[PDB]
Design a protein around this nucleic acid. Structure first.
Ligand SMILES: [Zn+2]
Ligand SMILES: [Zn+2]
Lengths: 323, 136, 263, 283, 189, 276
RNA sequence: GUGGAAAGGCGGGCAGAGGCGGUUU
């Protein structure tokens, strides 16, 4: 069973590897227009030079990179807002914005890793071939591999170090997700984040179909091979091949509604009270990335916080709900 | 020695700035010999490592040299020169030190016979990137 | 199958130094006893204090799979396993150096063959390698097959002191023994075939067309640069004497290790 | 014993990347994890090793899920038990995944006579000791079309640099990664050639090859397809049986199945007896 | 232990004057493994095969001393037929095929009684200095007996050689060539 | 008995990358001096014979009348009983594999496989009529080697476990796809009756070679050889004694292996059929 | 009146398993 369409309830943005300096951008009206340089430079080359690159290599004063093309005379993504600004762009395969599947698979794992450490137990998972674990992790912790030990005792355990997390033991390789359909030019828009940076994102009111599918044939082969604390918690119920999906969408619901209740602890407060609740990247805070909601913790985080909390246009920065 | 600079690389950018400014003083295409071309490339990448520039930030420019390299080899240059300028715009800082070596080479290349001078330009630009990773 | 064949060089000159027939009686009988009597103790691991440390691929067994076919006054044809034919080639020469006073030496040709090859053809190839190692400098071993340039400055066969110096330099960095690579160089089986693909750029055209920075690139992207620093930068000491580069002589040390860590 | 030739069924079409694929190999500047490319043209292809090997893989798990059902159709499937020979390091201890290659166990029949009865090893071949049953299919390397080669001439992007990040859960520090990926939508001319060795059971092999394709349209094709990098699609251009006489007289009278705008599931489920009714008349 | 000499050094050796050997040989004898496959169950069973491979401009020549009318009618039409079939060996794999050209070469040889043979000879009397080449052959699938020839470079004193006729039980007589090809030489004392 | 030599000259194109191998871990066969790869005459003749023996194995009943030596053979191999020639088509055992080789001159004179490819036999022999010359690179594909381009490439294939996804890599040196070689086949016209059937059978096996592979992995998609015919010359019996150009030349510039038999054998060869 | 005649270096083998370009002030 597939075609698990998503709706957006908030501005949502995927960071990408690019940013847009104001040489590419000039809003002639309130609609911010994104032009391409290759059609602007080469068509001006028939009308004439190193003076075009000298203003480009300067990056000074922008306003002067606009009037030359306005008088004596393009199209692109045309992402409207609805200077000295740096728009963090969204991911586009051909100028068409889509949601990457590797981003949606990661938001599920932080919920599933929370439920596995909540049901615990762990001494039976390390009872074999080791050569409720949060309370020992504070003494264990006393560009980083801090989840290299916690996820190895929860997802995939292989035998220098006692546990080193070979990927072959992982029950997450049966869950396949695929990249969603492209959203469209009209549902991509530029917004301003006010931290209690200009970014283009997806406004609420869009619908694209991400196609989540579960491979049952791998768990039948790997019934003996998996060494996860996830696996013990998911085989103990019984019917692990048919119980994995059941465990999947209940970790999606019980984690992010527990984060939503802690977040409530005016106009944004009405958004919290008013499908499957899921929270994606760049918008979720460290707590919604982290088992720090379960987390001793202040002594660990002082050496390794609820200070900053971003928001754009009266709304939090990610809430996407599936079926 | 090529291996001796790695012992010293691991204010030090100023001592190699005379080596980069001397190489930027000579801008004629094929003005150095085959052994002298690679000896310039050791001084470039050692200068580009003290004020270090990552290969990614350069990676769009390295793409346009390579897609043309299949099109030159039995298959234009201003498209690379337009990208080599615009990538140097969004610095921050050491992108100007990499622009002072491309743009003298690309201004001469801008009008040049295509089959020979670009294939000789492509050997120097490999050794800059190639030797840049050998030091870091 | 490893097949070694060698002889003692300038031996007819040495027997012509004798004044009396009692000196010919002594010179031809001590010479014969090294190959008749004392070459069997070299195979049995004896005399290792005098020999020291030779280029080996494994610890020397108590019963080596070595078959001595023929071993005359100054000749010796020996077949067996290739990794122990290789070590016996250096163990015999280092002990032949101690038996004489350094005045007489050994040319040795080595070969590596398919098993189900006719023995007239194994003998024909190593006889063509023993005189290839003899007309050049005559105190030199022919370890492995080699592609070379035709410029006349490049000789296929290593001097004896040269190849043991390249083994003390290059081999303990990349190799641990018994068909196992050095620690943190596991899963680099494809890495060491790249360095011999770089080395074949030198064979098509010398005088540094491309090989100097490509070595620095492949050592660069893997994070290991202590591996072979003499290959990345051109040797001015090599250019001033018109001798080959240090990337040319590393064929004989890599290709022996690639066959030993095949599986 | 008694190898005979009746002709070849040739399947031509266009593999399409509905989501961008990645096959990859272990240039100087470039993405850390690049994609395999043609050494003469620089365009990223799809190898025949990667397409045959994924079809043989997906068809072997399709047998172990139904060893109760496939056993009555084919002999020598009662020679073993379901599972792998991974715990007991033995080349034939009675499991389906019997032969190890270097460290991993793949189902390979050990004898010529047991490979002529297995559905996996008739179509794909065996190579036992003293045995060597050769394959009945050829899966060519799949290059770009004549259309998508012109897109590389005009400057449109064939590849892409996808950037991914693994986030440390506790400290929220990010480790970035870059992976080369063919742009989604690109198409590839593939070719699959079945040798009609026995007119008795050519019909079972065509249904078993097309069963494995529809499994591969459900799963991915190479390189991290649990994240989206598969979603591949077979589009059938032509379907053609070249009879033995074809190679004698050279005339272009060799019988053809239209297969136009039809899926891999349409060729088996909707019209297998209607389309192949004319192949059976010549055989 | 050298085997060949070029024309500058071959003339100096006939007059016992000093000379040098060539440094490179223009060919290599190469061991190419082949295979035999079962048609049904493709079992590989290899065997080893020897071939002479030449350089980019190297090759093979042979000499002819005789009247032009015999060369124009017999030897010159034979070498165009033998260019398309083989010149001994596995000619079904393209071995022995070649293109023929014709030249003229001059050798400055001293005048004496003793002369070297540039061919196998089957001598009629005892030679002076020689090397025994013992070869047989194969004639239409019939094995020829091993005959004691003389090698190339062996020294005779007024010996024509002699052409041997072997019955061999074949439709026609088989003649084995065996004749001298003398160039004068100066022997030592 | 001799009448002439039909010579076929063409270009062999590697549409997919080719492997033959000599034993980068699996190196392809090369020249000993220059280092360039080629295609041996043994590999091309041995594949054309193997493809055509399976063609004749399937048609032993229908070709008894045209080829009277095929009445003695039943389809199959003599491998299930370790015994020489008795009834089965694959009768001769060389070392460990079974091959059709006719045992006499008079039997191989009327076999479609052995009148063309030859027979060893005992107490008599049958030599070949074709010569399959080695195929080196073209002169056009040789300066790419001189300019510095790669003529061989390294294909790294892996082996995946089905339960654990354990990967086990290996390497295979492979001649680059696209590369063009030049072949030549010289057919010795020994009998003026047998030559039309021998050229059709040689072109049939060349048409089976374009849909099968040539050497190497092949089932994994390596071989994929295409034949382009530059020219066909006849070189009659009178050419060899006088040397003047009596060479009947059949012209084929873009003709396929199928188009040379797509009714073209009867038409284009109207002059060789004339002068016999 | 050729040290010849006959003989595919080949069969089987997914570059793959894991990873929210977003943290934080
Ligand atoms: Zn099977
Ligand atoms: Zn026959």
């Amino acid at each position: 069973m597939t075609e698990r369409t998503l709706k957006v309830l908030s501005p949502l943005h995927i960071g990408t590897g690019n940013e847009l300096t104001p040489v590419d951008i000039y809003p002639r009206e309130n609609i911010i227009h994104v032009l391409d340089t290759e059609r602007l430079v080469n068509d001006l080359m028939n009308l004439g030079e190193l003076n075009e690159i000298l203003a480009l290599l300067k990056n000074p004063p922008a306003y002067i990179w606009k009037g030359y093309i306005e008088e004596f005379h393009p199209s692109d993504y045309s992402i409207y807002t609805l200077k000295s600004m740096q728009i963090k762009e969204f991911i586009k395969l051909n100028g068409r914005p889509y949601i990457p599947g590797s981003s949606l698979k990661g938001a599920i794992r932080t919920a599933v890793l929370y439920k596995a450490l909540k049901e615990c137990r762990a001494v039976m998972r390390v009872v074999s071939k080791v050569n409720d674990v949060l309370d020992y992790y504070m003494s264990f912790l006393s560009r980083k591999r801090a989840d290299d030990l916690l996820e190895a005792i929860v997802f995939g355990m292989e035998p220098r170090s006692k546990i080193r997390y070979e990927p072959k033991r992982d029950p997450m390789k049966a869950l396949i997700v695929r990249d969603s359909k492209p959203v469209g030019r009209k549902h991509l828009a530029v917004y301003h984040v006010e931290v209690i940076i200009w970014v283009e994102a997806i406004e609420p009111g869009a619908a694209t179909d991400v196609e989540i599918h579960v491979d049952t044939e791998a768990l039948r082969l790997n019934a003996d091979y998996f060494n996860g604390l996830l696996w013990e918690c998911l085989k103990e119920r019984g019917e692990p091949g048919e119980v994995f999906e059941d465990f999947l969408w209940e970790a999606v619901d019980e984690f992010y509604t527990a984060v939503m209740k802690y977040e409530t602890i005016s106009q944004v407060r009405s958004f919290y009270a008013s499908g499957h609740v899921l929270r994606l990247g760049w918008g979720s805070g460290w707590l919604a990335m982290t088992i720090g909601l379960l987390l001793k913790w202040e002594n660990v985080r002082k050496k390794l916080f609820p200070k900053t909390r971003r928001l754009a246009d009266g709304m939090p920065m990610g809430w996407v709900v599936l079926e | 020695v090529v291996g001796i600079k790695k012992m010293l690389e691991g204010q030090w950018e100023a001592i190699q700035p005379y080596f980069d400014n001397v190489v930027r003083e000579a801008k004629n295409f094929l003005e150095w010999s085959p052994n002298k071309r690679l000896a310039n490339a050791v001084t470039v990448a050692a200068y580009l490592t003290s004020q270090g520039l990552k290969t990614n930030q350069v990676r769009k420019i390295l793409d346009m040299a390579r897609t043309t390299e299949l099109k030159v080899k039995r298959g234009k240059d201003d498209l690379v020169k337009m990208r080599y300028l615009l990538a140097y715009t969004v610095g921050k800082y050491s992108l100007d030190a990499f622009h002072r070596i491309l743009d003298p080479m690309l201004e001469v290349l801008m009008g040049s016979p295509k089959k020979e001078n670009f294939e000789k330009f492509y050997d120097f630009l490999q050794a800059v990137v190639a030797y840049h990773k050998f030091f870091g | 199958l490893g097949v070694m064949k060698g002889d003692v060089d300038r031996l007819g000159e040495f027997f012509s130094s004798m004044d009396s027939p009692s000196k010919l009686a002594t010179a031809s009988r001590f010479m014969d006893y090294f190959f008749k009597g004392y070459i069997g103790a070299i195979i049995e691991g004896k005399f290792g204090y005098i020999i020291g440390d030779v280029p080996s691929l494994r610890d020397w067994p108590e019963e080596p799979d070595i078959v001595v076919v023929y071993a005359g006054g100054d000749d010796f044809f020996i077949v067996g396993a290739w990794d122990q034919i290789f070590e016996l080639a250096f163990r015999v020469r280092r002990a032949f150096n101690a038996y004489t006073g350094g005045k007489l030496t050994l040319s040795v040709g080595l070969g590596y063959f398919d098993e189900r090859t006719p023995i007239y053809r194994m003998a024909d190839v190593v006889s063509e390698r023993l005189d290839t190692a003899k007309d050049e400098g005559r105190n030199r071993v022919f370890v492995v097959g080699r592609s070379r340039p035709l410029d006349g400055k490049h000789k296929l066969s290593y001097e004896w002191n040269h190849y043991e110096e390249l083994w003390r330099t290059y081999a303990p960095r990349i190799y641990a023994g018994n068909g196992r690579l050095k620690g943190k160089l596991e899963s680099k089986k494809g890495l060491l075939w790249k360095l011999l693909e770089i080395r074949e750029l030198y064979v098509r055209d010398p005088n540094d067309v491309r090989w100097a920075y490509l070595t620095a690139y492949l050592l660069g992207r893997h994070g290991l640069s202590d591996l072979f620093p003499e290959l990345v930068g051109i040797d001015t000491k090599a250019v001033e004497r018109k001798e080959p580069q240090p990337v040319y002589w590393v064929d004989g040390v890599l290709k022996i290790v690639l066959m030993a860590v095949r599986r | 014993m008694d190898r005979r030739f009746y002709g070849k069924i040739v399947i031509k079409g266009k593999i399409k990347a509905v989501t961008g694929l990645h096959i990859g190999s272990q240039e100087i500047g470039g993405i850390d994890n690049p994609v395999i490319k043609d050494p003469h043209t620089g365009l990223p292809y799809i190898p025949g090793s990667s397409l045959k090997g994924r079809l043989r893989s997906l068809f072997e798990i399709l047998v172990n899920s139904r060893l109760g059902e496939w056993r009555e159709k084919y002999p020598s499937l009662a020679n073993y038990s379901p599972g792998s020979c991974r715990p007991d390091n033995q080349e034939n201890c009675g499991k389906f995944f019997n032969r190890k290659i270097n460290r991993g166990w793949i189902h390979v029949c050990p004898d010529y006579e047991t490979a002529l009865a297995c559905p996996v090893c008739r179509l794909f071949g065996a190579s036992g000791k003293e045995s060597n049953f050769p394959s009945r299919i050829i899966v060519r390397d799949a290059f770009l079309t004549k259309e998508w080669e012109e897109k590389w001439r005009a400057g449109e992007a064939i590849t892409e640099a996808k950037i991914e990040v693994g986030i440390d859960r506790v400290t929220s520090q990010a480790n970035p990664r870059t992976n080369e990926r063919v742009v989604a939508g690109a198409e590839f001319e593939f070719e699959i050639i079945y040798n009609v060795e026995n007119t008795t059971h050519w019909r079972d092999d065509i249904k078993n090859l097309l069963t494995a394709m529809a499994l591969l349209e459900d799963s991915y094709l190479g390189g991290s397809g649990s994240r989206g990098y598969g979603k591949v699609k077979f589009i059938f251009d032509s379907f053609e049986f070249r009879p033995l006489d074809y190679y004698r007289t050279g005339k272009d009278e060799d019988i053809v199945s239209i297969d136009a705008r039809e899926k891999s599931v349409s060729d088996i489920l909707s019209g297998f007896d209607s389309l192949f009714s004319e192949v059976e008349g010549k055989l | 232990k050298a085997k060949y000499l070029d024309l500058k050094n071959f003339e100096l050796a006939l007059r016992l004057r000093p000379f040098t050997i060539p440094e490179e040989i223009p060919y290599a004898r190469v061991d190419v493994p082949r295979v035999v496959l079962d048609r049904v169950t493709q079992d590989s069973s290899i065997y080893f095969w020897e071939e002479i491979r030449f350089r980019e401009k190297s090759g093979v020549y042979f000499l002819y001393s005789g009247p032009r009318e015999v060369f124009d009618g017999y030897i010159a039409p034979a070498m165009r037929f033998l260019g398309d079939t083989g010149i001994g060996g596995k000619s079904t794999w393209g071995a022995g095929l070649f293109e023929v050209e014709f030249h003229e070469m001059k050798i400055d040889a001293p005048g004496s009684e003793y002369s070297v043979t540039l061919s196998n000879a089957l001598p009629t009397k005892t030679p002076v200095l020689w090397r025994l080449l013992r070869k047989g052959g194969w004639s239409f699938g019939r094995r020829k007996p091993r005959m004691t020839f003389i090698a190339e470079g062996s020294i005779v004193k007024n010996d024509p050689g002699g052409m041997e006729r072997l019955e061999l039980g074949l439709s026609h007589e088989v003649y084995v060539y065996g004749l001298t090809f003398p160039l004068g030489v100066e022997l030592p004392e």
